[PDB]
Design a binder for these strands. Sequence first.
DNA 1: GTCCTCCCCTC
DNA 2: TTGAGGGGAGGAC
Length: 510
Amino acid sequence: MSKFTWKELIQLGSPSKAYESSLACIAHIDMNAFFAQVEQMRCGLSKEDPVVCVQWNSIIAVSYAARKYGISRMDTIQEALKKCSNLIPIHTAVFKKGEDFWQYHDGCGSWVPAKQISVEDHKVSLEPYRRESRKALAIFKWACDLVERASIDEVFLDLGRICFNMLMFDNEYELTGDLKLKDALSNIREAFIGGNYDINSHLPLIPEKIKSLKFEGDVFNPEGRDLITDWDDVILALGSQVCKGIRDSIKDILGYTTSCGLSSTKNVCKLASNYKKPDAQTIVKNDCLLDFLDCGKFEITSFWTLGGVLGKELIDVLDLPHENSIKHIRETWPDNAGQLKEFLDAKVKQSDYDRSTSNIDPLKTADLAEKLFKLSRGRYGLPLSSRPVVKSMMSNKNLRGKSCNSIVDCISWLEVFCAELTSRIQDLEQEYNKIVIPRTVSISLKTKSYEVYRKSGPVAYKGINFQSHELLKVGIKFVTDLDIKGKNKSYYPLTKLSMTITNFDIIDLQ
DNA sequence: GTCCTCCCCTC
DNA sequence: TTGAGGGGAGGAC
Ligand SMILES: Nc1ncnc2c1ncn2[C@H]1C[C@H](O)[C@@H](COP(=O)(O)OP(=O)(O)OP(=O)(O)O)O1
Ligand SMILES: [Mg+2]
Ligand SMILES: [Mg+2]
């Protein structure tokens, strides 16, 4: 019989539990060369124009046209110009200190007179990118009932309902000119409509006729395994068809190309979306999970949450090798996560451990073992969270020279931050029909000696027309407080100043 | 009980 | 890098 149960299939129809099914169909979609594509589209340029988006002197995004020249993100604009004479460098929008609005200064930059965009007198605006991100999000949410915005240019989609409904109910989809999906799937549809199945019983064996169903995109398959051999493959393939449709809506409506990863889990999807770019969809079958994870590109540190100090501690505590760490984890504790838990409990129970400088929770070693056991097999299923309209907003200026050399300069930059945040808040209120209320503000700064000073606390609310004022009041309070705390110590000129609204109330309207 | 400060993760 | 942003522990209040 199938490896899968009626329970696992039917749970694809539940947004709260679909992710947990071995039959899950998740997509990760990442915008290609995002900031460069935004600038390309704003300036009416083409896929063939070698655009790079520039922030001060750094390339922050490189179009795929420009990458054909050898240009890489974080190249300096100087280096980029050597590699491509026809380069189209476009600087981010900016705010000018003393003004309360952002705009593009096209024709201006550190390349190029009276046309330089100085780091002393401006701050970056990323708002054109954020706007375009929210447009994309609207398109994704219209196509799919569960979408997680993972970062400015990434989303995850849970395709469970679309796949389930297509599998059971779609009477138009054609596999071939002589074969409809409804007829290929007559046995399973009969059983489902007949309703006479046990939720804990295994599914029938896939019908031979469903093997005509095609995947849309690149199926990762170096070992040449059979494409459709169980119901997970049927769902994944249907999912790839729908995902292509969604990605085409993004391309047709907004102009943006995407790369996409399709698999049963978020973690594998995120790896897969980065496998092939631009404008591509990489599909990882369950039976190809180990082939993919072990291709040589990935280590335990490639997994989300494991890319920093915890990951490095795990390499040391689990005596992981420098390469093929994923396979190592899998083969060293091959049967169950408890084997790994036992190993962890031993290392951590030792009196010479150091529990105050470790990122492993000794009380939660069952969860860590299960996470590593499953990640190493490509079967660690995390839920998608639908995020609120906004959670936090930051306005940040890293400062050069003496552009912030006294409390007067601090406040001058705070006025830019306050104007920016207020305009961002108004835009969200109009776009999403909400009242958006800052509740808590944090000021963070760095001295000339790079020492960090922070202060957070409540901000009062008196409506949108007084919002900038209410933010500034608290900011001025906090910067003057911190000035006192820095007396007789290395302080001015500052090397960084930022204001973040760290907590919002969101009121629904209509 | 919640708040503030400090910290870790990611693009 | 800079300029974002997500999240949580634990002592302060
Ligand atoms: N370290 C960073 N600092 C500031 N901005 C960044 C940084 N990394 C990425 N970005 C911005 C610019 C990118 O266009 C956007 C999305 O990031 P990312 O997906 O990593 O690259 P990308 O979309 O430019 O290229 P790709 O086609 O490889 O996805 O976020
Ligand atoms: Mg991208
Ligand atoms: Mg990204």
